[PDB]
Amino acid sequence: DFINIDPLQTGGKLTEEARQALLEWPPIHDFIHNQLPKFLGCDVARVTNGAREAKFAVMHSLAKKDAWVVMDENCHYSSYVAAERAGLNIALVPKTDYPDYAITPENFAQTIEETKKRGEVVLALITYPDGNYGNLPDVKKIAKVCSEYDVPLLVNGAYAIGRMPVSLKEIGADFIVGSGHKSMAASGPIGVMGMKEEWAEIVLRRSEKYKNKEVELLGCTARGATIITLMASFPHVRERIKRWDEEVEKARRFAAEMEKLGIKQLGDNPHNHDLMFFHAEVLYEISKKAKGGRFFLYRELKSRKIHGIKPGLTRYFKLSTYGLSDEEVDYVLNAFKEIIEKYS
């Protein structure tokens, strides 16, 4: 047993219901036509083989010869590759400078304009929050900047859906995407996608021969342990978001402790998500003389039953406090106190 602080896994721990259900192996229609569209606050929802497949599905459905897509600079590499696969030209809206690193409804709107000059822009996307810093840009705002430029907006909420409350309609965007494995306590690759009833005729167009199948999801009804676990955990995930405020308070507290210890939290301040990016100089210098150098931090934590940071990182790194109990939060803050002290 280890205390896990990997941002990729904290929101993906399997539920008891899901763990036990993954064994045995369903109201799937109910789940996607009713429960899911509600939960996402949108008209139509579909399950995909991952958030990046959901993104590619809409990009590909809207792409046109040489068209463009504008996505924030803090985007997920999958958002970018998905764009390359859809054959779109890619424009990145720049981020605020250190240590905010934010995507402002202005820089975004400018980038849109300065690019609507390079060719047709058929899509725009903001990552909410982004996977590098856990910053939550102002989507309600950006959804307007797009609604008043007539470009459709896709919200990449891989780190939002299943963690904090979200509503496509409350946001005012065209598409919303979520990840079952990083924020919905489900397994294998699985994603969720929600859109306005007006796009189901495009993104969810049917086959000319198999009028019952959807072209963009390759007629996949995608059953397997994947959908089962997603569903099994859904009740708990629904409840779970009612604690988001606690989660953020807990993260804020933690960063404040790191602050005192010398390692600084970047991006949103106060931060508004469990995923935090830290600048730990006192640790980078200790790596110059440490037992294993770059890998000292890892070894040290591995020893202290703590896994979650990419081994070899010391000057900068990200982590998540998501499902940690207060004792576990303290234990980690303390591991850092000790390690720093130990080395000089």
Please give the DSSP secondary-structure letter assigned to residue 314.
Answer: -
Looking at residues 40 to 99 of the shown chain, list those that interact with a copy of itself (rule: CB under 8 A).
Answer: 49-50, 52-53, 56, 60, 77-78, 80-82, 84-85
d(CA 270, CA 253): 10
Question: For residue 138, which amino acid is it?
Answer: D
229 is a contact residue toward ligand PLP (CB under 6 A): no
Quick note: the x/- pattern for a copy of itself over 3-42, rule CB under 8 A, is -------------------x--x-----------------
Give, rounded to a whole angstrom, the gap between the first and last alpha carbons of the chain.
Answer: 30
Rounded least distance, CB 266 to a copy of itself, Å = 22
163 is a contact residue toward a copy of itself (CB under 8 A): no
| Phi/psi of residue 46, nearest 5 degrees | -135, 155
Residue 33, annotated ligand binder?
no
Residue 132, annotated ligand binder?
no
Query: CB atoms < 10 A from the CB of 171, how many?
Result: 22
Stretch that binds a copy of itself, among 201-209, 233-241, 288-296, 313-321 (CB under 8 A): 201-209
**b/e sequence 43-81, b meaning 16+ C-beta within 10 Å:** ebbbbbbbbbbbbbbbbbbbbeeebbbbbbbbbbebbee
Q: Which of 110, 169, 198, 218 binds a copy of itself (CB under 8 A)?
A: 218
d(CA 70, CA 330): 41
Which residues, including other chains, have CB under 8 Å from residue 193's CB and lie 6 or more apart?
Answer: 45, 46, 47, 48, 54, 57, 58, 175, 176, 177, 178
Rounded least distance, CB 268 to a copy of itself, Å = 25
Host H or E run for residue 279: strand 275-279
Q: Which of 26, 219, 235, 293 binds a copy of itself (CB under 8 A)?
A: 219
Identify whether the C-beta of residue 102 lies closer than 8 Å to the C-beta of residue 269.
no
82 binds, among ligand PLP, a copy of itself, none (CB under 5 to 8 A by kind): a copy of itself
26 binds, among ligand PLP, a copy of itself, none (CB under 5 to 8 A by kind): none
| Tokens 């003389």, residue located | 289
Stretch that binds ligand PLP, among 17-25, 48-56, 283-291, 304-312 (CB under 6 A): 48-56
Quick note: the x/- pattern for ligand PLP over 80-119, rule CB under 6 A, is ----------------------------------------
Residue 135, annotated ligand binder?
no
Number of residues engaging ligand PLP in binding (CB under 6 A): 15
Q: By C-beta, is 127 or 314 nearer to ligand PLP?
A: 127
Structure tokens, 162 = 């299943």
Q: Please count the helices (runs of H) and the strands (runs of E) in the chain.
A: 15, 12
- Known binding residues for pyridoxal 5'-phosphate: 51-52, 156, 179-181
Which residues contribute to the site for ligand PLP (CB under 6 A)?
A: 50-52, 76, 78, 127, 131, 156, 158-159, 179, 181-182, 189, 191
Binding-site residues: 51-52, 156, 179-181
